[PDB]
């Protein structure tokens, strides 16, 4: 069911091939190739929107509307 929590799956796709910052978060088995420099992250997160963002969208909308 839609549970009214305002949570959603936040996916972060880290294709960091060639990156000098070493992987460390993933601790499962290694591939022995470029898959060791890439990762999919997912996390359940409450989605929030600020009043500043809301104000910005309001201003954009007023400026872009005509009639």
């Amino acid at each position: 069911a839609m549970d009214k929590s305002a949570k959603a799956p936040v996916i972060t796709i880290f294709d960091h091939r060639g990156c000098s910052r070493a992987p460390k978060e993933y601790t499962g088995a290694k591939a022995g190739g470029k898959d060791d420099e890439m990762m999919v992250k997912a996390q359940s997160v409450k989605i929030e929107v600020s009043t500043g963002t809301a104000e910005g969208v309001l201003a954009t909308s007023l400026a872009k509307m005509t009639k």
Binding site: M2, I11, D15, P23, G28, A29, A31, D35, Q43, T53
Partner: protein, 177 residues
């Protein structure tokens, strides 16, 4: 099902889950079109704020009464809730695209959603337009026919994945319209 993400998708905990290395090699052969699929997800979610804001502001420029004093986006509170919902929907669509399956979208986002909107008076025609703008954004990011110089990915034809993501948006539209 993506087993590493089972607790993510049930909101069972707030712990991050990680798929790299051999687990990622395997994920890409579990799902189809693996590299392109992950590129497609990346191009959508990395542009989420803009997709949602452009969709909501476009919904509004087409129907300005939404931010009149009687409209359902009037006040920062209502605008923020609408932007939030657009993002929730977009993120569930992005999970459908990551996994290649609409189930989590249907079950954890869409089931019961229309009845909530009906009870609140969230206008379904306007909501459908926000969703159709988001869909258009996603299809353009996935099936981006600009030259190699302008793409973050090796050039090739991602029209199939664009059609697939479009179908997930269509499931949202059918559920809430």
């Amino acid at each position: 099902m993506l087993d590493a993400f089972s607790r993510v998708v049930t909101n069972a905990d707030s712990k991050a889950a990680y798929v790299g290395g051999a687990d990622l090699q395997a994920l890409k052969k579990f799902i189809s079109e693996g590299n392109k699929r992950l590129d497609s997800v990346n191009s959508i979610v990395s542009n989420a704020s803009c997709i949602v804001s452009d969709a909501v502001s476009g919904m509004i420029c087409e129907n300005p009464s939404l931010i009149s004093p009687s409209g359902n986006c009037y006040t920062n509170r209502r605008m923020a809730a609408c932007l939030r919902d657009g993002e929730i929907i977009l993120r569930y669509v992005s999970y459908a695209l990551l996994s290649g399956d609409a189930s989590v979208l249907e079950d954890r986002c869409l089931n019961g959603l229309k009845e909530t909107y009906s009870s609140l008076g969230v206008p379904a025609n306007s909501n459908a337009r926000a969703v159709s703008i988001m869909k258009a954004c996603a299809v353009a990011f996935v099936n981006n026919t600009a030259s190699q110089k302008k793409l973050s990915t090796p050039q090739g034809d991602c029209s199939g994945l664009a059609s697939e993501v479009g179908g997930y948006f269509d499931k949202v539209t059918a559920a809430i319209s």
